[PDB]
Design a protein around this ligand. Structure first.
Ligand SMILES: Nc1ncnc2c1ncn2[C@@H]1O[C@H](COP(=O)(O)OP(=O)(O)O)[C@@H](O)[C@H]1O
Ligand code: ALF
Ligand SMILES: [Mg+2]
Length: 726
């Protein structure tokens, strides 16, 4: 039996809507009509189903749940779809396309663990927050080669469609997986990669998969929104030869959240690797590295959280090391990696105290000595580099004597540099292993850090949210703007629709050059010798307050500014932004570590690709300018691919299964442009081929006549160089 047609198969059990019973059939053939309405008009996302009992020319009257009777204009009415549509696999098929109707369909599917639903040309994936057995090899095998309409919605299906388009069109593809923090981007990314590796595979393929536990160990952490939050964005190029077999892969990582190494908010964790090393190391290795439990380290004992429900850090450590072995990190390199992790922990335990004067001293040198031992550096040199770094004053060489706060910050800067550089080094090592062939093609899978809002939002959140805004605009541009520009250019008699989705004003507020946006004003302040966080916020207010519609100068704070993003307004706290943008590290610290006896540490400080910083005239390039440039480069790459969108949707903000919260979901459906995306797919003309190229596949001087002969008139329209189909 073909599992697709076998109602006993796991495919049918886990990916198809369950058979309705005879009572549902009765309800399904009912002549009655229903409407979605709000019992409480202030709560616009909480809906009940009311029966339409009467109508006028312009209105419906319906019975509420409590049994009263309401009236509503037909043009304002959210009619409920005939219930034969409940659970439908592609929501472009719905008769009534409205918010409660789309949400209801997602809910019916979600309630039976069907997390994937097509919304026209793109896939919607609602996080189940539990394991559903739909990602086995057997599932992979079922989707292999199948057209999207032959099989159930699945991340595997869109992956296969991209793979088939790559071969059929000889064009690079991308899979763009959007979603707010914890929505499921990383999980789905991993599934796309699993699938491509299996269907296009011929050890290389295993190394591709095993890159993930490494990067997640060093790059992921518990935040309040996601127990396994990615703290770096990544674009994975899965590379193929001309025959369509996997030839390699390349990982581009984007800015890692280095600040997490030295500070975590309440209930959050540092990067997983710290907890994995401490829980998972042998008592031998804990002695050589001078390690104890998490509670003995300032960098791990501030949040009040050292464990994650359902996660064994010692077991994860074993998975991380196995991945490192498979990828090819030597035992030497692995030990050096954990020396750096241990050393960072020790550096964090250094306690600076006030000396006779304003300058800091280090009374207890235990932590300094353990760090220096594991890194292979001179402790006296390190001590002097932390508290008495030398700088130029003009051309004179002057020993500073940093006070306690500056010493502690410099120490943090060293830590963040060590961690950030190690991460870049891990990625580079992985890439060199996965770089074995010049590619013919690639499918690029984008997994950015998801849109996030916390009590305190800093520069890191602005960068993340800016990226999410840019990705949403990329969706807007491809689904709506480019689409409609093609229709109108080809004169298929298209009436332009304003879909009301445009993130450009927010993007410009952030990254504008002329007039200067936030990032540009930040950069200018960053190289202005007398700038402070206060002159910076004042500068932002001066440029944007009551001037830019997406900016708010709050009345309740002098140190925050609000950006209205697609996903909601975010208040950003300016504290430390100049320093975060400059990302300073005392040169004496680099000089100390350049002399490291450790082969990995020495690479982190001597390899120009890792250690060197690009210059913009008399200054180093800022974090913001670099960020902006890497993102612009990503977007340019994406523009050369055929994109496929997966919209991950989080069901609630508690990381709980079986708990769709309608306001949480509806906010995402709205700001993602899901309904608008379904509408363009229904009302528009998805596919078009130049007439001459259509005739040759299905020669003539009058290529249009040949096209009409071969051809229902409604499902097509003749353009000036192309035929258009539905
Ligand atoms: N399809 C899924 N199946 C099972 N768990 C999932 C699935 N998608 C999301 N997860 C759950 O939600 C968590 C957060 O998802 P993740 O992909 O890490 O978020 P992000 O969108 O921030 O990358 C996962 O660690 C897992 O617990
Ligand atoms: F926690 Al994420 F994308 F990994 F928002
Ligand atoms: Mg992630």
């Amino acid at each position: 039996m073909n599992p697709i047609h076998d109602r006993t198969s796991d495919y049918h059990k886990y990916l198809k809507v369950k058979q309705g019973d005879s009572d549902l059939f009765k309800l399904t053939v009912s002549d009655k009509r229903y409407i979605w309405y709000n019992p409480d008009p202030k709560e616009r996302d909480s809906y009940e189903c009311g029966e339409i009992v009467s109508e006028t020319s312009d209105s419906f009257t319906f019975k509420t749940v409590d049994g009263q009777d309401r009236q509503v204009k037909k043009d304002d009415a959210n009619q409920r779809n005939p219930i034969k549509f409940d659970g439908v696999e592609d929501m472009s098929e719905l008769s009534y396309l409205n918010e409660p109707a789309v949400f209801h369909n997602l809910r019916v599917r979600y309630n039976q663990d069907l997390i994937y639903t097509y919304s026209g040309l793109f896939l919607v994936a609602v996080n189940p927050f539990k394991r559903i057995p739909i990602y086995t090899q057997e599932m992979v095998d079922i989707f292999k080669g199948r057209r999207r309409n032959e099989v159930a919605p699945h991340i595997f299906a869109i992956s296969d469609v991209a793979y088939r388009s790559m071969l059929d069109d000889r064009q690079n593809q991308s899979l763009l997986i959007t979603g707010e923090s914890g929505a499921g981007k990383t999980e789905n990314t991993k599934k796309v990669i699993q699938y491509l590796a299996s269907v296009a595979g011929r050890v290389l393929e295993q190394q591709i998969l095993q890159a993930n536990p490494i990067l997640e160990a060093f790059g992921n952490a518990k935040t309040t929104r996601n127990n396994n939050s990615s703290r770096f964005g990544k674009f994975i190029e899965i590379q193929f030869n001309s025959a369509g077999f996997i030839s390699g892969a390349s990982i581009q990582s984007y800015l890692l959240e280095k600040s997490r190494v030295v500070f975590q908010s309440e209930t959050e964790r540092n990067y997983h690797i710290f907890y994995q090393l401490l829980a998972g190391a042998t008592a031998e290795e804990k002695k050589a590295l001078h390690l104890a439990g998490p509670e003995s380290f300032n960098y791990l004992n501030q949040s009040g959280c050292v464990d994650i429900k359902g996660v064994s850090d010692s077991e994860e450590f074993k998975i991380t090391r196995q991945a490192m072995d498979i990828v090819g990190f030597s035992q030497e390199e692995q030990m050096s990696i954990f020396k750096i992790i241990a050393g960072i922990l020790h550096l964090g335990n250094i306690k600076f105290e006030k000396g006779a004067g304003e300058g800091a001293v280090l009374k207890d040198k235990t932590a300094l000595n353990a760090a220096s031992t594991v890194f292979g550096v001179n402790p006296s040199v390190l001590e002097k580099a932390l508290m008495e770094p030398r700088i130029l004053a003009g051309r004179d060489l002057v020993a500073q004597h940093l006070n306690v706060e500056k010493s502690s910050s410099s120490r943090d800067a060293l830590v963040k540099a060590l961690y950030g550089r190690l991460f870049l080094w891990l990625v580079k090592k992985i890439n060199n292993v996965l770089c074995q062939e010049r590619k013919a093609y690639f499918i690029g899978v984008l997994d950015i850090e998801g849109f996030e809002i916390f009590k305190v939002n800093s520069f890191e959140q602005l960068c993340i949210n800016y990226t999410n805004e840019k990705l949403q605009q990329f969706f807007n541009h491809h689904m709506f703007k480019l689409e409609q520009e093609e229709y109108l250019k080809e004169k298929i008699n298209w009436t332009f629709i304003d879909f009301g989705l445009d993130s450009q004003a927010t993007i410009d507020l952030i990254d504008g050059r002329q007039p200067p946006g936030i990032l540009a004003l930040l950069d200018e302040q960053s190289v202005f010798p007398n700038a402070t966080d206060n002159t910076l916020i004042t500068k932002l207010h001066s440029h944007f307050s009551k001037k830019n519609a997406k900016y708010e100068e709050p009345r309740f704070s002098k140190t925050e500014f609000g950006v209205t993003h697609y996903a909601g307004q975010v208040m950003y706290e300016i504290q430390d932004w100049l320093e975060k943008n400059k990302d300073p590290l005392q040169q004496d610290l680099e000089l100390c570590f350049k002399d490291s006896s450790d082969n990995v540490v020495t690479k982190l400080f001597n390899d120009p690709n890792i250690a060197s910083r690009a210059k913009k005239g008399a200054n180093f390039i800022t974090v913001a300018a670099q960020y902006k440039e890497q993102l612009a480069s990503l977007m340019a790459t994406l523009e050369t691919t055929n994109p496929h969108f997966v919209r991950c949707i989080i069901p609630n903000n508690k990381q709980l299964p079986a708990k769709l919260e309608d306001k949480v979901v509806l906010d995402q459906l709205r700001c993602n442009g899901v309904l608008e995306g379904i509408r363009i797919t229904r009302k528009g003309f998805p596919n078009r081929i130049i007439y001459a190229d259509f005739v040759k596949r299905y020669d003539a001087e009058d290529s249009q006549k040949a096209t009409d002969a071969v051809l229902d008139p409604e499902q097509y329209r003749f353009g000036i160089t192309k035929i258009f189909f539905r």
